[PDB]
Design a protein around this nucleic acid. Structure first.
Ligand code: ADP
Ligand code: MG
Ligand code: ZN
Ligand code: ZN
Lengths: 613, 627
DNA sequence: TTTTTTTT
């Protein structure tokens, strides 16, 4: 056959890079041949794929091998796999076989990782076709894993000659001429499913990131393909980097299974479609188990702010560092992010522990910046404007793809996390009702379109509206000062109503603060804690499970009685007591106390009292 | 020559199936399987499979139940072999079933030429997402909720054919249920050609497919639920209904189709499961029958039941009574007397009415819960879509003698109208006039006039429902957010205690957890309603019904004083029957009628609060509260 | 179904 002496040279260099790499940071520069050690671990677990750092092979042999493979990855891949099999035979001959009946050949997936750079979706070019690259972006769509037919096998339906180890092209391929020279069967190739080996496969769609080419352009999208262990390796709707080769997808319909090339196809033309074949995938976007996940210094820092007793106030201060004032509102953020203990009673009734906050401020109150910080600083956080939004896009949508199927809405896109709702006032009343039922149920059911599916839809909602007429009439009542269905009002945990004040001192302070925010830009802000530090502490608190206390039971019952008397009930109901308990849970989580404290209930009582105004 | 079971341990074959297909290997496997069936026994020593065969013949069932653990207990080698290559050993074990059944029931082939093996308790389990190509071609135990079901249509179990060229007859090839035959050749003349199916020789098996979707809870949070299709074959066809959670065990098969090929531009195969044994994941028993019969007593059994209604919800004892009566219901007397008890649960928002409705949902053997805004009147009634051309039923229709939980009170309104007037759903969709008998109880709830209840103006004025709608309710309930420091304190104590008891921190502890908030255990209660409705059929007391007549006449007189209807009398009778049922009384007693009178008189009192409430109270103090 | 000017 074709010598491809360069190919076999690359094979040899690749096996020598896999076995004689002789590099290891463990025990300082002491060489372990980390690829030989990875082969040893491979024997321990008997996987298929081999993780290969691009930088390792780059330092290997001056990176000439890295360059060659990175360009002609497609051409070199069979040689690389053959060399990997040779290495396995050398050191892990057991793994050389799949490893009872006969064990077939084991396929090894060379999933290179840690590439030098990531090229953006628009950076993609035909020049890179077949070259190993890495692409970043969020996963807009995915596919159910399905068994691509890697190696095919067919029984000759005229002589029974069985074929095997037939690689398939994009279109389902079949043997052309019977291997049995005596036989002359050119069709009738009953696929031997048992003999043939199928690899797992999954289509995945991604879109351009916001700060990628935002300049006057719609975010470009790419169809990457997951194979082998990579399948399902990443969750949907998350920014991740995919390393692999650029694959050109010919139209199978043209293959037969502007114009296109022809005269091969034969008379038929052929139109292509570029795509990407991911080899390795990396995402970039218990209390004791969480601590284990943390680094030693990270655990120390955790303990450090745990020891701090002002920690509560400093955290509240850290919230929305750019935003000035409205400290109670920042406290509301913190508490909602912490959430509350969700529980289902013995009777089974589910009791939500989440907190759905609502904000009613005049324009320019920076509520927009408020939500921007919230979502940006919040995982599982979705931001949307009520004025421009569709119910299905917000909760869930039904689409037909070969065939009726479903598409997650904002609630799904952020279920079990923050749900920012900007311009809520402008939001459609019917859509508001859809959310109402969905959030109250903590569940979304797609009854329509024939299908009757249902999804968890559990999450927290940060409603953001403006008072009717762009201004809150203090003479009027919250219910009436803003257009919104009262029952949904009942299930909004909080209502931060933002008013204007002519306090000259406050005006001067805020003006100076803004002007500094522009002068010194980032230098102006200085929260007590870093956002990553804040998130680590927050998750640690999430790990906590507050427990109610006898004194707390009492304090709660008297405080609820006092609230009922205060309204004496347009805004005071059993829902208010439920929110009181949830706020107590959130405060304890901020206090990182497994038990509730009447002080915590006092804080929550003051919070709700202020919300009442 | 045949081989030993230990010899079978040495697979010594290219594949597990390759080993199984070995002739002597097949003989050994069959012998061992028959040995297991006849020999393997419960610890009691009785041949569990012997009794299973006995029943199989008796019931004429064509599917034989099999427990995987039992074979794992003995002959586990065959368990592993089957797991690796389910199809082959399934066929062999089915023949073993032939032999085992015939010896105990000679000539059973007449009753069923064949039998189907039904493995059970398959240890390994995977979710739809868990499924992997490694899993393919092997048995898998999976769970989910059926999304859509197709009608049971016949399929060609066995097929002969006829070459158009000569084609007198072609072999009776067995259809695989996943692909066509496509012989693409003729034995009579060596070549291709149109191979007309031989209608003379062909076996037909019932065929069906139902889509299965991952359970919501099973879905990882944020993760998108996935669904796979599972083909159901004869016997297994039409076991469960769409929207029902189910677990199945079948071979994870697959096949080629250029459709997906072009769709994904890659050589990928569609994957499907051929169900071998289905399982849906309440019914009382003799122990519970006799236990209910004892506890059925005059000792405030009605009161105890009410106390166990919505125990998570404080007070509302009248509401608890109404919902209990609805759960048990009343005996219908067709000719067309309704037996259902339609109850509306009007209340101030956030008054837990939705929560008690959900409680009933959990506490209801069959019920339908829908949202007036989030539920479609079409989805309540029916819809038509291509299957092809087919219709589907509606939620109201889905409610068959089962309480129809609903709230948030258009097309839905007229659908209820037709429903309340007659418990059936007429429809002429696609120019096909027909009716769908729902015959089910209804439960309603809403906010008066979309705002805090108003004592002024009657209850009807406090709502917007048409008076017909109001009357056709067996009863109506009103809840008001009145403020009382003592009641508020009691409610707060109850709520905080509920949160504490429900807190995760707080199995054997369940007995202390229930805290006797419910006098009867909830499970026993659920079985109680089921057993009572199934068996208890109250008999009205004509002698007492005379006093009922004069009482209704008095109520009519007072309505003229300031509006009763025969519907009120029928509601009183129905709820008296329900009272009898709650205490497992097949004979209605005067006390049932007294409670019915009080309840219905109260439901009449809810009308016209500021107008007449006091006058009605004075008039009926003896009729409703006097005794 | 969802989005969508446009008229009714
Ligand atoms: N009697 C009661 N006992 C316990 N909780 C109650 C009671 N009445 C009202 N509640 C509380 O009110 C809250 C809201 O009730 P909900 O079912 O939403 O009423 P609605 O259906 O009117 O919205 C519930 O969480 C429930 O705990
Ligand atoms: Mg409710
Ligand atoms: Zn051949
Ligand atoms: Zn012929």
């Amino acid at each position: 056959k074709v010598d491809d002496v360069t190919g076999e040279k690359v094979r040899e260099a690749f096996e020598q890079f896999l076995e004689d790499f002789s590099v290891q940071s463990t025990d300082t520069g002491e060489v372990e041949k980390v690829y030989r050690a990875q082969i040893e671990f491979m024997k321990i677990y008997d996987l298929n794929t081999i993780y290969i750092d691009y930088q390792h092979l780059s330092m290997r042999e001056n990176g000439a091998l890295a360059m060659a493979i990175s360009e002609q990855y497609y051409r070199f891949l069979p040689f690389l796999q053959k060399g990997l099999r040779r290495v396995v035979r050398k050191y892990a001959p057991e793994l050389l076989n799949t490893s009872s009946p006969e064990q077939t050949e084991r396929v090894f997936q060379i999933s290179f990782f840690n590439l030098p750079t990531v090229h953006r979706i628009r950076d993609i070019r035909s020049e890179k076709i077949g070259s190993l690259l890495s692409i970043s972006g969020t996963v807009t769509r995915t596919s159910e894993v399905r068994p691509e037919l890697y190696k095919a096998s067919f029984t000759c339906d005229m002589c029974r000659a069985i074929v095997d180890n037939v690689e398939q092209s994009f279109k389902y391929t079949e043997p052309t001429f019977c291997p049995n020279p005596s036989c002359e069967n050119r069709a009738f190739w009953t696929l031997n499913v048992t003999r043939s080996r199928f690899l797992d496969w999954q289509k995945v769609r991604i879109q351009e990131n916001a700060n990628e080419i935002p300049t006057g352009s719609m975010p470009r999208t790419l169809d990457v393909i997951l194979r082998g262990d990579s399948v399902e390796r990443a969750k949907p709707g998350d920014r991740c980097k995919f390393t692999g080769v650029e694959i050109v997808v010919p139209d199978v319909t043209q293959l037969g299974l502007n114009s296109g090339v022809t005269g091969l196809l034969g008379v038929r033309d052929l139109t292509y479609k570029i795509s990407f074949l991911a080899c390795h995938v990396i995402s970039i976007g218990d209390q004791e188990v969480f601590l284990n996940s943390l680094s030693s210094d990270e655990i120390n820092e955790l303990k450090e702010m745990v020891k701090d007793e002002h920690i509560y106030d400093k955290l509240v201060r850290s919230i929305a560092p750019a935003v000035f004032g409205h400290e109670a509102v920042k406290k509301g953020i913190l508490l909602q992010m912490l959430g509350g203990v969700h529980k289902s009673t013995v009777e089974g009734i589910k009791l939500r522990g989440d907190i759905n906050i609502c904000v009613v401020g005049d324009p320019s109150t920076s509520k927009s910046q408020f939500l921007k910080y919230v979502v940006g600083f919040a995982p599982r956080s979705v931001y949307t404007s009520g004025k421009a939004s569709s119910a299905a896009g917000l909760t869930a949508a039904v689409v037909r793809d070969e065939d009726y199927t479903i598409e997650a809405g904002a609630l799904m896109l952020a279920d079990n996390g923050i749900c920012c709702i900007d311009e809520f006032d402008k939001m459609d009343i019917s859509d508001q009702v859809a959310i109402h039922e969905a959030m109250e149920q903590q569940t979304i059911s797609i009854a329509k379109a024939g299908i009757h599916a249902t999804l968890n839809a559990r999450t927290s909602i940060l409603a953001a509206a403006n008072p009717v007429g762009g201004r809150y009439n203090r003479k009027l009542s919250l219910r009436g000062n803003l257009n919104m269905t009262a029952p949904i009002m009942s299930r909004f945990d909080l209502f931060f109503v933002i008013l204007d004040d002519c306090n000259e001192k406050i005006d001067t302070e805020l003006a100076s603060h803004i002007v500094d925010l522009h002068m010194k830009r980032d230098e102006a802000i200085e929260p007590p804690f870093s956002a990553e530090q804040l998130r680590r502490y927050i998750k640690y608190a999430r790990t906590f499970k507050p427990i109610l206390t006898k004194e707390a039971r009492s304090y709660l019952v008297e405080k609820y009685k006092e609230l009922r008397k205060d309204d004496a009930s347009y805004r005071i109901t059993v829902r208010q007591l439920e929110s009181m308990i949830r706020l107590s849970e959130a405060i304890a989580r901020a206090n990182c106390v497994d038990e509730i404290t009447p002080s915590f209930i006092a804080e929550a009582y003051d919070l709700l009292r202020q919300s009442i105004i | 020559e045949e081989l030993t079971l230990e010899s079978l341990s040495n697979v010594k074959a290219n594949s597990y199936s390759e080993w199984i297909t070995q002739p002597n290997v097949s003989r050994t496997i069959a012998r061992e399987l028959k040995s297991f069936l006849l020999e393997y026994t419960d610890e009691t020593g009785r041949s569990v499979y012997g009794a299973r065969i006995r029943t199989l013949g008796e019931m004429n069932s064509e599917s034989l139940e099999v427990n995987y653990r039992h074979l794992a207990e003995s002959k586990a080698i065959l368990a592993l072999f089957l797991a690796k290559c389910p199809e082959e050993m399934l066929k062999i074990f089915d023949l073993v079933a032939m032999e085992a059944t015939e010896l105990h029931y000679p000539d059973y082939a007449r009753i069923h030429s064949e039998i189907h093996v039904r493995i059970s308790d398959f240890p390994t389990i995977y979710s739809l997402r868990e499924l992997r190509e490694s899993n393919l071609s092997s048995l898998v135990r999976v769970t989910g909720v059926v999304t859509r079901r197709t009608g049971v249509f016949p399929q060609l179990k066995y097929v002969k054919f006829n070459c158009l060229k000569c084609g007198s007859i072609l072999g009776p090839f067995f259809q695989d249920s996943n692909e066509e035959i496509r012989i693409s050749f003729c034995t009579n003349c060596k070549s291709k050609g149109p191979f007309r199916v031989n209608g003379e020789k062909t076996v037909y098996r019932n065929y069906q497919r139902v889509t299965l979707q991952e359970a919501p809870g099973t879905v990882p949070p944020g993760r998108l639920p996935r669904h796979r299709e599972v083909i159901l074959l004869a016997d297994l066809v039409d076991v469960s209904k769409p929207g029902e959670e189910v677990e199945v065990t079948g071979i994870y098969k697959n096949n080629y189709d250029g459709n997906l090929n072009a769709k994904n531009g890659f050589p990928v195969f569609a994957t499907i499961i051929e169900a071998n044994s289905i399982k849906r994941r309440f019914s009382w028993t003799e122990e519970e029958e006799r236990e209910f019969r004892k506890i059925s007593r005059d000792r405030g059994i009605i009161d105890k039941i009410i106390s166990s209604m919505a125990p998570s919800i404080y007070g509302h004892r009248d509401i608890k009574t109404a919902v209990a009566c609805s759960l048990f219901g009343g005996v219908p007397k067709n000719v067309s007397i309704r037996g259902d008890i339609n109850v509306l649960l009007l209340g101030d928002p956030g008054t837990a009415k939705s929560q008690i409705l959900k409680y009933v949902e959990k506490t209801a053997h069959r019920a339908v819960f829908a949202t007036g805004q989030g539920a479609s009147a079409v989805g309540l009634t029916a819809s038509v879509r291509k299957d092809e051309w087919t219709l589907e039923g509606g939620a109201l229709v889905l409610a068959d003698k089962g309480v129809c939980l609903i709230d948030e009170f258009d097309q839905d309104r007229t659908s209820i109208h037709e429903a309340m007037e007659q418990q059936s759903i007429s429809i002429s969709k696609a120019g096909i006039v027909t009716t769908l008998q729902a015959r089910c109880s209804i439960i309603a709830a809403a906010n008066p006039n979309g705002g805090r209840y108003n004592s002024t103006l009657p209850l009807a004025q406090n709502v917007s429902l048409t008076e017909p709608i109001l009357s056709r309710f067996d009863i109506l309930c009103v809840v008001r957010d009145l403020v009382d420091e003592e009641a508020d304190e009691r409610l707060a104590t109850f709520v905080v205690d509920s949160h504490v008891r429900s807190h995760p921190e707080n199995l054997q502890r369940q007995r202390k957890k229930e805290e006797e908030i419910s006098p009867i255990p909830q499970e026993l209660l659920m079985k109680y309603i089921h057993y009572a409705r199934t068996k208890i059929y109250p008999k009205l007391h004509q002698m007492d019904m005379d006093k009922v007549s004069r009482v209704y006449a008095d109520l009519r007189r007072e309505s003229i004083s300031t509006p009763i209807t025969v519907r009120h009398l029928e509601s009183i009778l129905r709820i008296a029957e329900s009272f009898a049922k709650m205490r497992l009384s097949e004979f209605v007693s005067s006390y049932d009628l007294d409670r019915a009178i009080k309840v219905v008189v109260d439901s009449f009192v809810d009308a016209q609060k500021v107008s007449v409430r006091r006058q009605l109270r004075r008039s009926f103090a003896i009729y409703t509260l006097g005794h």
